[PDB]
Amino acid sequence: QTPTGIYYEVRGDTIYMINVTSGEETPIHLFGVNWFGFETPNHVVHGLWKRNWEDMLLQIKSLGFNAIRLPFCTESVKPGTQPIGIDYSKNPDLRGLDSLQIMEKIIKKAGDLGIFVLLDYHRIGCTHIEPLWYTEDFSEEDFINTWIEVAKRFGKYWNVIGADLKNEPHSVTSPPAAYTDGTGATWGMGNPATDWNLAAERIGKAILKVAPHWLIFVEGTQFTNPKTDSSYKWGYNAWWGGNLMAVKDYPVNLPKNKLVYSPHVYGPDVYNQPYFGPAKGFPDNLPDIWYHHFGYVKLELGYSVVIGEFGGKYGHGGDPRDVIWQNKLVDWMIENKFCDFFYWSWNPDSGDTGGILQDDWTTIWEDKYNNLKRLMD
Template sequence: MNFFVKNGEIYKLDGATGKPKIIYLFGVNWFGFETRDYVVHGLWARNWVDMLQQIKSLGFNAIRLPFCTYSVQEGTMPNSNAINYNINPDLQGLTSIEIMEKIVAKANELGIYILLDYHRLGCDQIEPLWYSDQVSEQQFIDTWVSVAKRFAKYPNVIGADIRNEPWGATWGTDDPATDWRLAVEKVAPKILEVAPHWLIFVEGTYKTRPDIDERSWYPYYSYYVFWGENLRAVRYYPVRLPYEKIVYSPHTYGPDVFRQPYFDDPIFPENMRSIWMERFGYVKTELGYALVVGEFGGRYGHGGDPRDIIWQIKFVDWLIENRICNFFYWSWNANSGDTGGILKDDWTNIWEDKYQNLKRLMDYCSSIN
C-alpha cells in the first residue's frame, strides 16, 4: 500500500486494486513511549486492546505514536509500574518496541493508521534541535532507519513525523547546525530508502528567519507562536523533497497551554482566523501542500482557562471553512497536564463535549469524501 499527496490531499494506493483513494486522518495522540515509562500510558488502568477498540468506536482512524530514542532500542524494557499485567497479561516480558509493534499490528487489524513521531531524543524533555549532547545527528538518522526497517511492513503505518517541535531550529538560513529544512532534506531520504511508501511529516519551528517572521501581519505577535506552529518560511523555502511525499504538520494551541497576547485582543476569537492562516493555513490553501494538524487541544473548560472552549470551537470552525480535514488531537491520554485528554481521569469515560466538537469536523469531512 502506498501513500502519496495529490492536490493537497493524502491518497492511499491500494496494492490489490491499484486504485487511489483520498483518506482523511481523524487522529489522536497516545503518548508514553517518549517518556521514561517507555510505553503508552494508561495501561495501568486499561487493557491495551480495549483502548484501541474504543478509539476506533469513536470514529478516530489514526494514532500519532510519540517515541524517544531509547524506547525503540532493542532490549529496552518498559517501566513495570506503567503496566498492570493482570489486565495486560500478553505484554508480560515484552520489550518496549515489541509492545509498540503489537499496538501497530492490532491497529492494522482495526483499520487504524499509525504516524510514528520522534518526539524526544532523550526521554525527559523536548530538546531544541534534532540532535543533542546525548544523541548525535547520525544516531538520530540511524534510529529512524532502524524504526523504518521494523515498521515498513505494516500497511497502516502512514509515515514519519521527523522531529517533534524543533523549537531551537531556524528555517531557510542555510546554517547546517540549525536549519530545519536542511535537516529534513538530509534525514527523510534515508527513511524513504527503507520505506518509500511512507509520507514525511514536517513540523513548523518557533522562529524561522527575522526577515520572514518580522513581516508578519501582526508584527507585535511575530514571535508569539507555539512550538511547531511556524510554517511561514515554507512560502520562500519549501522542503526540497518530492511534492507527493511531503506533509506539513503544525502544532497550535489555545489559552490553556500558554496565554498569548492575542487571546486578550478585544476581537478574540475572530482574530484567530488570520493568525492561523498566516502561520500555516496558507500552506494548503495557497501553496497546495498537504496539511495535517499534528497537535491541538486543551481542557475545554474542565479546569484551565474558560476561553479554551471558545478557541477550540473556533479552530474547528476554521478547519471546516478551509476544508482542512486531517488532525491528531492532543491527547487521548487523561494525564496530559495542560490539556487533559479525550479520556477522563478514570481512563475509561470520555469528555463528551470535547469529542462532539471534533465530531463536527469528522462528520463534515466524511460527507465530502
C-alpha cells in the same frame, strides 16, 4: 514501490492510499489522536495500569477516529527497554515484552482495526523535547540511524503511513539571539547547523530510501529567520513546531508526492499568548493568525497540511477561554477543509490539556468530544 503492498502518496493537498494488489486507490482522511507514553520514562503508551491496550484501540475506533500519532523516544525503539506501568492482570499478553515488542503488537492490531499510525520521533531522551534534532550527546547521524532502524522495522506494517521527523523544533533563547546563537531551530538561515528545513530534507531522504512507500511529516519551527518572522505582527508568537511562515520562500525539498507539512497549534491552556486577550479581538482575530502561521501553506500554496497536535482542557478545570478557542479552531478547520488532524491527547494525563478521556481513563469528556467530532462529520 512497497514492502507491504500498500503505498502512500500526496496528490494536491490530499493523502491517497494505493493497494498495489487490488489496484485500489482512494483518498484517505486522518481523524486522529495522539496516544503518548513511549516517549516518557514509562516507555509505553500510558493508561495500561487501568486499561487493556486492545480495548483502548477499540474505543478510539468506536468514537470515529481512524489514526493514531504515536510519539516515541530513542530508548523505546531499541531492543530491551523495560516498560513500566502496565497492569498485566488486564494486559496478560504483554507479559515479558520489551517496549519495542509492545509497540509492534499495538501497531499490528491497530492495522487489523483499520487504524493508520504516524510514528513521531518526539524526544531524543525520554524527559523533554529538545530544540534541535541532535544534542551535545547525540548526533544528527545517530538521529537518522535511529530513523533508519525504525523505518526498516515498521515499514513492514501496512497501516504505518510515515514519519513525523521530529517533534516540535523550537528555540530556547530570544531573537535575534535565536537566529544565530546556535541553541535553537531556524528556517531559512541557510545555515546547516540549525535550519530545520535543510535538516528535514536530509532526515527524510534517508527514510525514503528505506521506506519509499511512506509519507514524511515535517513540522514548523518556532522562529524561522528574522526577515520572515519580522514581516508579520505575530511572527514571534508562533507555537513550537507551529511556525510555517518560512515555507513560501524555503520549501522543503522532498518529493512533492511524499511531503506533508504538519503544524502544531494550541490554546490558552497551554500558553497565554498575547493575541488571546479579548481586547485584542479574540477569538475573531484567530483565523488570520492561523492563516499566517501555517494555513496559507494549504490554502495559498496547495500543500497537504495535517495539524499534528491541538487540544486543551475545554473548560474542565482550566482557562474558560479554551472552550471558545477550540470551538473556533474546529469551525475554521471545517470551513477551510483542514480535514486531517491529530488531537492532543487521547490520554487524560496531559498537564496542560487534559485529553479526550477523563481522569478515570474510561469515560470521555462529552462536550470536548462533541466539538471535535464536527470534523469527523
